[PDB]
Structures are given as C-alpha cells and as structure tokens.
Design a protein around this ligand. Structure first.
Ligand SMILES: CCO/N=C/c1ccc(OCC[C@@H](C)CCN2CCN(c3ccncc3)C2=O)cc1
Ligand SMILES: CCO/N=C/c1ccc(OCC[C@@H](C)CCN2CCN(c3ccncc3)C2=O)cc1
Ligand SMILES: N[C@@H](CCC(=O)N[C@@H](CS)C(=O)NCC(=O)O)C(=O)O
Ligand SMILES: N[C@@H](CCC(=O)N[C@@H](CS)C(=O)NCC(=O)O)C(=O)O
Lengths: 238, 235, 263, 238, 235, 263, 60, 263
C-alpha cells in the first residue's frame, strides 16, 4: 500500500496526549443539557472569591474557630504589631489552605495582584484607627510603625467604616513567581499596627475580634499544572 | 502582550489521565479452591483520591470520558517452564445483564456487550465513552434517600436505605479474563485503568476536601487537625 | 480532520409576597426563581400562586456565649406549613425556589457576627464507624433543625446505634474548612451595622423537577463567627428568627397522600 | 516513506469498531433482492404490537394457558382488588416476558408512555362496571377504591364496550429509567377494582374470564444495548 | 430536543461481534493414533445461542458478514524445550471442492480457494464477505423437505429426508492448520471466530425463543417452565 | 473514503370470488395478493382465473370444554381440492395467495374466545429425542389437520418410532410463549361480539416461485383463549368451520403427474 | 510524524488481496505484444463450445 | 503540515554629564542606554535625572612592574556614592546603564599597554575545594576592588576558611584563555598613542528590572598586556584612575532602607 516510516515515540502512552479513539457505544442518544445556575468557565474565577484567613495559628487555637479571629483591646501595647505575615499565597501556612492557596497548589507559577480585606466586629460605640502596611522584599522585615509607614500603607478608621480593603499590586523582577518557598521569588511582608488606639465608653466591652479575607484581582494568572500535597492515600479500597 | 488564562480553563484542568483502578488477574491450572482466573471491577472514580478531589470542586458535572488500559505481567516461579504470549478480554456489563460465574461460561460470547481483546506487548488499549447520565448532569453530591419509610409499612426494613445514595448498581462493571489456557507455570498480571474527562462543564463550585476521605460519602474519622502551628506576629 | 462518526471520539425597605410583608438582598448565582419552560418537561402541572408562596416563620432559637451553630434543610423545614406541605405530600414531583430572611436585633453595646450560608446538596457526616448509616428520621429534623459541635463524639452504642449526624463547626460538618464556606451564597450579620439578612435561592438540581420527600435541595447554616458579648455581663442571650417564603412552586403527579414515619 | 507515529490503541480489537476490511470473494454477482412483505426498519416497531400479559402467575397456573386469564364473578368481594402490579416493563415477571419486555431486556435505558388494553370475554347478557387506576410512586400502594380513585383512573362499562384502553403517560424525574429493579427509578402501580358489580340474568354463566394486553406508544425510546438474561448455554455442540 | 431511536435500528442492533466458534489445533510429532494436527469447522451461527436468538426475531434476512479471528496458544509440558513463533493457515472450502485428509496434502496449495496466513502475536485477523445466498434472502426457518416419497419408489429410504433442512452441505467449511513443523514440545492453540452482520435487512418478525434450544431445529426437550411464581394481587 | 472496490468491504357484507359467495377483514402486512411482475422471473406460466380461485370448505371440527386447539398447513390442506390440486401436482413450480374465513356461531348465553393466527414458515417440534426426524406423511396431514396438547409426551417406542409432532398449546408448538403470537397476523372471535373471522394472506417466501409439494408456505393455528361455557351445563360442543380461497395462482413446469405416498 | 492507529487485520496475508508491491526490476523494456489469433476474454466462451458426451459408460 | 496544536511540537573632546565634565569612545553592542518602554513593565518608577547621573571617581591605584591586574563589580562599586547608593538601598528594584572612563598618563619614554574589558555576568572562581562557597562580603569588595594572581593558591585553612576568590590572570579568573577576552567589549590603552579609554555599557539582563543589592550586572577588568618600563630604571610606578557615571537610572519598590553587613 502507501509507503510509511515509523518515527520515534510510536506505541507510547503520554497521559497529556490529545488523540482520537473509537467509541464503544455508537449511536447513543445523549440527554440534552439544561441551564443550571452556577456554571464555571475558569478556575481563576474561584480564586477571585474572598475567603477567611486563619490568622491565629497558635498551638491551643489552631484547628478551631478561634483561629479565624484576631483579638483587639483598648489596653494593648501600642508599640507592638497586631499581626504579621509574608506574601506567599501558596506556601505560607496562613494562606496556603485558603481557596486561593488551594487553587495555586495545583499550579507551579503564579502572577498578579492581591486584595486583602479586614472586618471589625466590635460595638458601635468603639472607635479607633489602624495602619496596614505592605513592604517589598530586600530589607529587614518591619518591626515598628516608623519602618512600616515607609512602605505601601493604608489608614483605617473603625468608627466610620467597619471594613477596610488594601490592594497589594504586582511588583517583581521575574515575570512569574514560584508557588513554593524560595528566596529568589520572595514577595514581601504584610504588617499591622495601631494608629491611635481603641477607645470605648463605660458599660461597653473592652475586647473585640477582627476577621480577615483574601482574594485575587482580575490580573491574576497561573502556569504549569501539577499535583497538590494536601491530599494523600495509604491503602487502596478492598 | 499580557498574561493569559489558557491553562486555567476547566478543559485544561482535567486534561490528564488519572489512574482509577488496579486489577489483578492470574492464569494457572483451575482448582477447587478460590482463584483469580477472572476479575470484576465496579466502575467509579472514588477508589482513588486525586481525581476525586479535583472533581469534587463542583457540585454538578457533565463530560465524556476516555479510558486507557495498561497491562503488566510476570512469573511467580522458575521450575515449571515458561508461557507463550497471552490475550486479555475486557467486557463491559451494564446493569441487568448476566454476570459470569466462571472464566469460560457463555456470558463471554459478548453478542451485544462491547468487548476489547488485547495482545500483550502491544500499545496500551484505549476507548472513548459519551455522557450516559440518566439526568441532565452527573450528581457528585446527593442529599437524600432512595426510599421513604411509611407508617403503614409492616417493618422498618422496607423503607431503609443508605444515605446519599441514588442507585445501588450504577454504570455497570468491567470483567477481565485471560483467554489463553493455563500453562504449567502460573502467570500473574495487573491491569491499570486511566481516566481522562473531555468536553467538561461544571456547576456550583464547592470548597475542596481538607481531611482524609473515609468511604464513598463525606464521613471523616481520623486526622482532623490539618493546620500547623505558626506565630501570630512571626513572618 | 475527524475520522470517527461519534462526537465523543473527537479529540479535545419592605418586601411583600402573597399576604405577607417584611419590613441589601443577595440573589444566589444571579438567577431569579422562574417557572419551567416549554422546552423542558416530562401532564398538567399544578402551580399555586398565593396559597403557598408566602412567608412562614419557624421556631425562634437562642444565641448565647456557648452556642456553636444551627442548620436546617429545605424543603424539609416547610413540610408542615399550610397547603405547601399538603401539595408536597399529594404529588410525586415538586419544584420551588425560596426566599430566606434571618432576623436578629440587639443594642449598640452588644457585639458579635453571624454567618449565614446557603449550600446546594448539603450532605453531613455521620457519628459512627459505619458509612452512610444515618436514618431518614434523623436526617429530616423538620422546623426544629439541628446544631453544630466543636468535637467529633463517636457513638459507642453497639446494640442500639443512634444513627445521627455529628457536624463539626470548623469543618462545616462535611470535612471542609469553614473559611472557604464563603464560596457558597452567604450573608453576614454584624450587630454594629445591620440586624437582618436576606437571600434568594433559585431551584438548583440535575433535573428540572424532582421529588421533595426523599431529596432536599438546599441547606441553611448559621454560625457565630465572633462570640456574643454585652458590657461585662457573664451571661448573654438573644433571639434569632428565620422566615422562609416559597416562590414559583410547581407540583405534578397527583395521587393519594404520603405519610412518612417520623419516629 | 511518509513519516508516521503510532498512537495508543493500535493493534487492538474492539467488537464495536467500524473499519474496512478486504473482501475474500472479489467480483461476486450478488442476487438482486425482491419486495417481501413484512420488512422491519426499527426494533421499536415490534414493541408497538400488543401482546397478552400472563397476569395470573400462581403456582398451579403459571406456565399454562390459564395464566393468561383473570377470573370475574358476580359474587366476588367488591372491597378487594381484582389485580395489581407495578409499572416495571422489563423487570416485573408479569411484564418481563412480553414482547415489549423481551425487546427492553436487550437495552439498559427506556423512556416513554405505555398503553394497556383489557378484553372482557363474558356473555352478551352480562353487565358491569370496572375501574382501572394508575398511581405514580411515592405513597403507599393503593389497597382500596378510595385510594385508587385519587390517581389516574378510567371507568369501563362492560355492556357497552367489551374492550377498554388506558394510556399511562410518561412522568419521571429522570429523563430515562433503568430497565432493572431500582427504587430511584420506580414507575408507579397499576390496580383494578369493581365499580358496581357483575350482574347476570338466569340461565347464564356466573363466572367469566378477562384478558390483558400491553404495548408501547410512538414516544418510546431505548438506550445502551446490552445482553439479555433470558437465554443461556451450558455445553458447546460436539 | 426530543428522544431519538438511533440505537434501535436493525443495523445498530446487529452492530456487534459475536463469537460463533471455538476451534482447537495442536502441533506435535505425528503418530499413528488420532491427532488434532488440522481441524475442519462447518460454517453456521447455530453453535452459539446469543446471535442465534437475536437473528431468530425475524423469518427472513439479507446481510453481508465480517469475520474476525483471535488465536491463543500455550504449552502442555516443560521438559521438552521450547518452540518458535508459529504460522496458522485458514482455508475456505466451498461445497464440491476436495477436502484435506492430512495436514500436508496437495489440497493446501489453495490455487483457487482463498486462504489466510496468520502470524502469532499480530493483530487478530479480519475479512469481509458479501451476500452469497442462492435465493433472494436467507431462510432462517424452512417448513418443508428436500425429497418427496413416491408410491413408485422401490423402498421408503429413497424419499426420506430430514425435516426443516434445505441442503446437507451449505456454505462450505473452514480448515485450520499449523504450517510450522513439529517442535520437540507439543503446543496447543485455540481459534475463536467472531461474526458481525452488516447492511442488514429483515422480514417477517417472530416471537423470540422462550425455552433452551435443542438441535438445529425448533425442538424442545427440557426446562419447559420459564415463568416464575407471583401473586395476582401483589405489587 | 472507501479504499476497496467491493461494497462488502465498506464500513457500516358479502364477498364473492369465482362461483362462490360468503355472507372487519384483516390484510396481512398490508399487502394484497398480486401476480409476478415482468422484472422478476426465471417459460410461459399457467394462470387459472376461476377454475382454482374459489372457496373450498374443509371438514368441520367440534369445540368443547377440553379442546386445546387445531392447526393446518397451506397449501397442504388444499392438495385434493378440484383442479387446484391437479395443477399443483402437474407442475414443478407454484405460487398463490389465500383468503381464510373461519365460521363459528353460538347464542347470547354462550361465552368464549378463539384466536386465529397465520404464521409464515410455521415449523413444529417433534416427539422424540432424535432431532428433525419427523416423517413427510405425518407433517402433511391434509384437510383433517392436527391438534395441540397441554404437555410434552415423549415417544417411548424404540422399534417403530411414530415420528410425529408434539405441539404444546402454551408454547405454540415451537418453543415460544403464546402471548406473543399476536405479533403474527391474527384475528379474535369473541362470541359476545362476532361470529366469524377473515384474513387475507399474500405469497411470502425467499423466492418468487417455489414448489408446493415439498414446502408449505403458511400455517393456520386456532386456539381457545377462553374456555367454552353455556348456562350451567356440564358438557358443551359447537361446530367450527374453515373455508379457504386461493387467489392469484401461477403454475410452471408442466410434466407428468406427481403421486406422493401418504401412508 | 502523522499520528496513526493500527486496525485489526494488519500484517496478515490474504491470498485474494489486491495491493501494490515494489518492483524488483525497475526500468525494464517490455517486449511489445502482437495480434495472435484465438484471444479469449471470458471463461464462459469456452463453455459455449460444443463437445462430445461419453453417454455409454458401461464397464467394458 | 503541522498536526499538533502547540508550536513547540512543530519540527525545527569634552563629555559633560550632570554637573561633571571630562576632557574614540566605544559603545557596547552598539546600544545606547535607554529607559524602560511602556510595552514592558511589572507602580510609579522613580527616575532621578541629575542627582545620580554624574561622574564619580574611585580610589586611584598604582601600576608597576609586578602588577598583575585589577577588577571591579557594578553596581557594587557605586554603593556608597551620593544619592545613587541611597536610592539603591531604599528601593527593591533598580536599573541603570554606565559610562566608564579610565585615565592613565605617562611620558614618551615610557612603554606599556593596558587592556580594559567589560564583562556581563562576570563570575569568578573560588579558592577552595568546596564549590560556590564564596561569601557575600568577599564577593562585593566595593570601590577598592580586587586583584589578579599568576597562580592558584589553594586555601589550606580547615577551621576558618577564607571564602575568597582566587582569580588567575591568564585564565581571566573564570577558566577561559585571556586572548579571547576581546570578544567582550574592550579598550586598549597604549602609552605611545593614547592615555585614556572610554566605554558605554547599556543595561543587560534576562529581566527588564532587577535588584541591585544581590546581583551585579557588570564587571570591569584591567590587565597589563605588556609590562611597564621606563628608560633603564629598576622600579617604575604610575597612577591609574577610574571614573563611572550612571545613565538612565530607574528605581521602584520604595520601603525602609537596607543595611547589608560588610564584615
Ligand atoms: C469493552 C469495554 O469498554 N466499555 C467501556 C465503558 C467505559 C465506561 C462506561 O461508562 C462508565 C460510567 C462513566 C461514564 C463514569 C461515571 N461517573 C460519572 C459520575 N460518577 C459518579 C460516581 C459516584 N458518585 C457520583 C458520580 C461516575 O462514576 C461504559 C463503558
Ligand atoms: C480464507 C478464509 O476466508 N473465507 C471466509 C468466508 C467466510 C464466510 C463465507 O460465507 C459463509 C456463509 C455466511 C455468509 C453465513 C451463512 N449464514 C446466513 C444464513 N445461515 C443460516 C444457517 C442455518 N439456518 C439458516 C440460515 C448462515 O449460516 C465464505 C467465506
Ligand atoms: N504497596 C501496596 C499497594 C500500593 C498501592 O496500591 N498504592 C496505590 C495508592 S495507596 C497506588 O496509587 N498505586 C499506584 C501504582 O503502584 O500503580 C500493597 O501491595 O500492599
Ligand atoms: N468449560 C468448558 C468449555 C466452556 C465453553 O466452551 N463455553 C462456551 C459456551 S457453553 C463459551 O461461550 N465459551 C467462551 C470462551 O470461553 O471463549 C470445557 O472446556 O469443558
């Protein structure tokens, strides 16, 4: 018949190949689809949904509801930070298990800006001011308000607004950052401090709780699909 | 240019062949005691966890499937001679069709059931299947029962059914046998099945699993402390 | 070029409803409830307009410092609400959307936060080594609903197993972290800003119409994101109320009445 | 020659494949066909032909002519049903072996409406009225005329008409139902009751027989060809 | 859209390969006593029951055929060495052609008879055949005889013939042999034949078989109680 | 694209006939009898018009409470009917359609039902372990016909086997359930509605024309679907009569007469 | 190169097959034919020629 | 014809700058320094114009008969030069080109030749068996620079390894023959013809902008191609001076100041 020549790679099975195969059930009447609410076209759409951050991962509070709450008080040390973490969406323990982190753990490279939100759950009579700062990598991590203010910072007034949003923009030497811990693709640091203090009147609680959320913006992209480390198996079903 | 989201699509996210089943089949002289001459496997994707976890991101799905079969054989002893190349038969038995009781009964005639004959040493077998769901979409999660107990029932077992189960027998089974007769030396073989969804549509995204699976349902037994320790004010 | 014939082979304010009135809202998936269209069906449906599409109020619950959460199932919670339940039990197939309103009022000196989540196909975990052994009666509490727990209490009974759910608050009762529950349609009630929440749920299922008795389409979960407190008092309790209104309900398959055995 | 690459699935035999093969008898003069009455184009055409139902499957009457007859009398208990069965065309023993059931046993899924016919074989002087009811699944199976009448029911007058027809329409949550026994795809129940009674004059038989037939309508379809359980083999011919 | 009847067509109903024959052939040193060096099989579809039952739904049929051959070989002992890959010869002998009397006689020259040479380990063999019926359609059922006794016949055996039989030798036979010479160790092999009708037309539908087959005809001997017990007023 | 040349390789009231008159009808497969067309043949045919196409009446039979059924074969039943039989035995090839009329009259106080079935290529089962051993004489009873049985009586003779059929009523004498026999052309005579049945059978065979002596084209089966009864009498008997009219008959191959040996 | 899939019947030899094969003597000058009497196109032409019948097949 | 979708599968005088003035030039790769274009970026950059783009003079070195060579790293050498260093340490990302001017004057009775080479990604070899064990402090000498050697002196310390470079003159300190070093941008100062050299270096890197602290973009190497001599004197020494001017410098990522630990 037609002369042919077999090339390398013949009779191999590549799990990522895209070829045609015969159908074992020809002439099948497929049930037509219907319009079901909640259709999803891209996985990034899930990364754009805000989800809570387990900020408090202490030994006696992790794996418990209280791990989602950060305590605030009117008698706290104003010279010390309220919370601090690193801009590692997929490797930081406080961000790895979020929906953004769960989606990222299936990919090797990521790029884009991020959005952080903070919700104050005190009484209507409580007032105060807070400072939320982001610092790009390269220098010592901030330990005081004076150092933090030199970065990208936002001032939040609790009384007027119960929620605050800060956008961390994309700034990097490389076009894409790895999803694993690596000093060559470090992202920066996030810190919080008191601006003036929490002030409350009499017959009012002196302690309150705060919540945090994270999400991705519309300029977020991922590369290089890969397996995750968050699920394992030891014995196959019998 | 600007960065794209080509690889984050649903099709790309599921464009991988994932193992879903390892099945053992042996060829040896038949005997009175139990043997593994032929095997039957119930079709599902919940035996493994990676594909299950990826699919459970959504509540409803609709897709076609591609199946690939990889066969590996070996000996067990050395003083009983050798064997010639073997041929494997794989048959799909839908619900209601008769099931084999022996490796050489009439059920293997496969007059209407599709079957694949595979010769050892060739390329891994492959087939494709369309969407065969009774409803308009597959239901990964079902919050309900198949029976409802009634006050007039004679006993409580009439209306008893498992929670979160639609049908007892769904999608049929696959029966695998070795067509060749038995050589004087036993030969063992394993068939690995890899599944790839195609033309995938999904609805109602859900949060992913955070603790080890326990059974076909959403039950959890052990390892309920996923998060690790970390300082509040530690970078 | 495609060779095979089959495609599979191809390579890849006041709201008034009926005679009820309540004095921003959230629409799930941006889809308002609607009736079945002529291009999708399987006899003459029965479509009550005002005798069933109205607000029904459930039993009030109490929220304190030690409360962990509550959950309800729909349409299970409305099985004994006027003519809606009668139509549910007199017909083989049913369909409906819902409007959920959660009410909780406090003072300016209180503090706390409630999270309300609407979950499609909300499946809960058991309380025993056996898998999927929960009973129908325990899985359909009714309007009373259930409660969450902070730990997994395995049932030690061997003679008379309870066959009940054991939800865990921080796992959402299904093995997923609570922080991601916001992926579902949700609302937050913060006592310092608002005192009520509203959600609109369309009909969601793999089929256009399905039985209401053996299958529940929606689940409602309410959990305290922040503990309740008031001044410096040791004990604090406030009421929480839930109201539900069916919308665009259809029924088919008229026959004798169903009488499930609830204990 | 032409470079080529062998893909997975090469050199395999799929019984449902559709490929070309060489002919072993080239240049054969095929006998032309003729117009023979009774040509069949679709198997559903056979399912649309009415066939008798073995309603009476008692121990002493099954596998006998009497299994096709249902007894009626003027002294029967009017409060008890005459006959009862389930809408399981392929799994119910009384319907499985009918032509419709035989065709369905070769397929896994079915959908569509059904037509039942009842023939009265009494004397011309006999009169009476009957009620034939269908009940969708979900509730207790009917045990009395009061419960049955709430479903889809037809009233049949023996004197005016010796035959009655009732159409069971398609009503289901799923688009297709399985051909095997399954509570998730249950179809419903069929029952019969006396409306007034059988009345006969003197010098006339007081007992009579009734026959039943079933067929499929024009909106009937099947899916997923599969082998049947009604034929078996133990030893190959020698 | 609306449900279709694509898969209920005659072509789809018969678009499956069904086994119709298992044939044994052995390779060993020839001896005086009986042996299985070459085998002959009479072509028909009544050896098995599934395809026979499917075809008997109709009285008359007209179709082309596709045949596939699957070969599986094995050893019997271990102390007589091994063997090299074998080649199998399959020859079609129509009525009237000479039949072999040995595995190496002149009849295997196949000057005019078609033949297939198959190398073990390759893909299963395949061929296609057109409609070769003498009449305008195949007759699954024949109510008659081939001879009619006459008053003038000398004896009653002149006009005696089997009931419901057209021709004694119809469609010829298939002869299978192993071309290779005998190795010091015996080697057994089985050939399985699978048949698929194509371009099928049918006439005069008939009710399907309800009791086990007994012979080429419509005779029945045992198992004449197919239906099971069930209550008259029991759902 | 097809590569091979061969297609097989391609991948997939009063009715008067002649001098006879009888005073709704069923047409088998919706095909009226017709003569052979010029586009299908194999000499000058002989086509009698009125000397053979007329009603012939067979022997009357009796139906009682213990009757199980009767069967006849065509054209066997008409082998000794006027000139039709002479033409049948004087020619090698024959062809014809049929009209069958079944008569049975009763009173308004009787009850019963008869099923009449026309079966193409009606093959019956034997009465011995040997397969296809039935004799020609036993397979062609003639106008008397045969009867059905309710059980299989195996022949125990070893020296002089009977070589006869053993039809079973509920298996239709061929191993198929009687309930599906309605797939064939059929009629029902119910004593409370009608008293007669009529069927029209065209010529059906794999060949345009075939021998009539060694092959029977049609079979007629009459079975009581419901037992006969009358008032409260212990014994009841009524007559059943059958009439058959050939239609559009052709003969070819004239030669000396055939004389089969019937016992 | 070009993806391909091997079907059943590959590497088999059917004596009635009709395929192309390479030529072992390329560029051969074939001797031209001539008009020879008695050319035959069909075997039936031989069956149309009358031949004697051995009617008497007695032993002697 | 390409079958696969992916492309990868497809088969294959006075110069004045700022407030500084110096009284032919060589442009590396024929590319003048330029600012980042709008079609390539990753916030508002900071682009000093005259406060950082000006000539800074390094410490003078001495060339004699036994001198083997000198080397410097950029932007390391300018880390403590006015506001350029402050901007370098106050920003996470930086970018800049350079202008290098080498001055060395002698008389008509002297003789010698200097080769100046600009090397991108100039990596030097260590002085120990361990691989890539050089310390940050030793790899960033600053404005003082380093010197070459004529032999490889392995470090024998085992307790306190020096962790320093050991460049070799004839291997260019990187294992390549010096004769081919002219492939890089280069200049030759011959005392009998000229007394100065000038080079212009654009920004070269795999990324548009990168950190200046942990990565050095350029290296400058000066080696004596011919030994220095004067009349018949035994000892001769003359000064060599280096001046560097940043050009088109951009900075981004403002935050607190970085304080590296240099010993
Ligand atoms: C000759 C052998 O080839 N026959 C092969 C074959 C393969 C697959 C076939 O379909 C099996 C069902 C699949 C389409 C996948 C079923 N899925 C989709 C939804 N689902 C599932 C399981 C458990 N809970 C929820 C959903 C599944 O397990 C049919 C025939
Ligand atoms: C080199 C070997 O390849 N030759 C193969 C071959 C295969 C089949 C050939 O035809 C055999 C006859 C078939 C067309 C099927 C005959 N059928 C159709 C009708 N029929 C049958 C049998 C018994 N009762 C009634 C009908 C059959 O058995 C001829 C040659
Ligand atoms: N080592 C185990 C079997 C290991 C096993 O089956 N592992 C599963 C998951 S726990 C798997 O994915 N195996 C992949 C493979 O080896 O093919 C045993 O034989 O006792
Ligand atoms: N086990 C039997 C042979 C079994 C057999 O031949 N079974 C037939 C039908 S009863 C069959 O379909 N076999 C399929 C196959 O094994 O290839 C024996 O060797 O004594």
């Amino acid at each position: 018949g037609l002369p042919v020549l077999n090339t390398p790679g013949s009779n191999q099975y590549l799990t990522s190949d895209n070829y045609q195969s015969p159908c074992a059930i020809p002439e099948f009447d497929v049930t037509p689809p219907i319009d079901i609410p909640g259709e999803v076209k891209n996985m990034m759409e899930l990364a754009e949904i805000d989800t809570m951050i387990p900020l408090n991962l202490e030994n006696t509070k992790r794996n418990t509801m209280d791990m989602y709450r950060v305590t605030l008080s009117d008698s706290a040390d104003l010279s010390q930070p309220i919370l601090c973490f690193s801009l590692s969406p997929a490797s930081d323990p406080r961000l790895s298990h979020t929906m953004l982190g769960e989606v990222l753990n299936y990919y090797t490279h990521w790029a884009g800006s991020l959005k952080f939100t903070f919700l104050f759950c005190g009484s209507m009579m409580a007032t105060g001011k807070i400072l939320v700062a982001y610092a790009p990598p390269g220098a010592q991590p901030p330990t005081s308000r004076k150092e933090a203010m030199l970065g990208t910072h936002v001032i939040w007034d609790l009384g007027l607004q119960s929620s605050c949003t800060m956008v961390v923009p994309w700034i990097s030497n490389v076009t894409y950052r790895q999803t694993t811990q690596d000093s060559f693709t470090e992202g920066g640091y996030i810190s919080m401090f008191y601006q003036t203090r929490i002030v409350v009147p009499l017959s009012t609680p002196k302690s309150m709780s705060m919540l945090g959320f994270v999400s991705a913006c519309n300029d977020f992209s991922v590369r290089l699909l890969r397996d995750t480390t968050h699920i394992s198996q030891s014995a196959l079903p019998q | 240019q600007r960065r794209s989201r080509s690889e984050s699509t649903i099709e790309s996210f599921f464009a991988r062949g994932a193992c879903v089943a390892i099945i053992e089949v042996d060829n040896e002289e038949p005997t009175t005691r139990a043997q593994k001459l032929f095997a039957m496997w119930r079709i599902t994707y919940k035996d493994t966890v990676q594909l299950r976890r990826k699919l459970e991101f959504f509540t409803y799905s609709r897709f076609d499937m591609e199946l690939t079969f990889v066969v590996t054989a070996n000996f067990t002893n050395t003083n009983n001679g050798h064997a010639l190349n073997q041929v494997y038969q794989i048959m799909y038995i839908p619900p209601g069709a008769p099931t084999p009781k022996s490796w050489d009964d009439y059920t293997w005639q496969t007059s209407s059931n599709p079957s694949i004959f595979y010769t050892y040493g060739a390329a891994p077998a492959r087939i494709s299947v369309p969407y065969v769901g009774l409803a308009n979409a597959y239901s990964h999660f079902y919050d309900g029962f198949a029976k409802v107990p009634l006050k007039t029932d004679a006993n409580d077992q009439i209306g008893d059914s498992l929670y979160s189960a639609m049908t007892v027998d769904d999608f049929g089974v696959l029966a695998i046998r070795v067509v060749n007769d038995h050589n004087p030396t036993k030969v063992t073989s394993k068939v690995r099945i890899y599944m790839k969804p195609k033309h995938v549509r999904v609805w109602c995204p859900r949060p992913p699993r955070a603790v080890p699976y326990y059974g076909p349902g959403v039950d959890y037994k052990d390892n309920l402390n996923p998060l690790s320790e970390k300082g509040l004010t530690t970078y | 070029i495609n060779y095979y014939k089959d495609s599979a082979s191809n390579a890849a304010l006041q709201l008034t409803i009926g005679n009820s009135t309540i004095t921003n809202s959230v629409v799930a998936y941006g889809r308002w409830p609607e009736f079945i269209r002529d291009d999708e069906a399987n006899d003459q449906p029965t479509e009550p307009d005002v005798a069933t599409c109205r607000f029904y109020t459930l039993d009030t619950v109490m929220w304190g410092k030690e409360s962990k959460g509550w959950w309800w199932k729909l349409p299970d919670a409305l099985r004994d609400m006027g003519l809606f339940g009668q139509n549910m039990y007199y017909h083989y197939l049913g369909r409906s959307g819902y409007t959920v309103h959660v009410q909780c009022n406090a003072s300016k000196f209180h503090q706390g936060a409630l999270g309300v989540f609407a979950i499609p196909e909300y499946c809960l975990a058991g309380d025993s080594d056996k898998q999927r052994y929960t009973s129908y009666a325990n899985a359909n509490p009714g309007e009373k609903g259930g409660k969450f727990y902070s730990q997994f209490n395995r049932d030690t009974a061997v003679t008379s197993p309870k066959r009940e759910f054991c939800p865990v608050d921080y796992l959402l009762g299904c093995g997923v972290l609570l922080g991601n529950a916001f992926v579902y349609p949700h609302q937050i009630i913060n006592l310092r800003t608002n005192n009520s929440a509203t959600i609109v749920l369309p009909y969601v299922n793999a089929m256009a119409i399905d039985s209401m008795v053996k299958h529940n389409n929606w689940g409602i979960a309410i959990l305290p994101l922040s503990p309740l407190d008031f001044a410096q008092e040791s004990s604090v309790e406030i009421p929480i109320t839930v109201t539900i209104a069916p919308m665009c309900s259809e029924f088919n398959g008229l026959r004798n009445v169903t009488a499930p055995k609830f204990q």
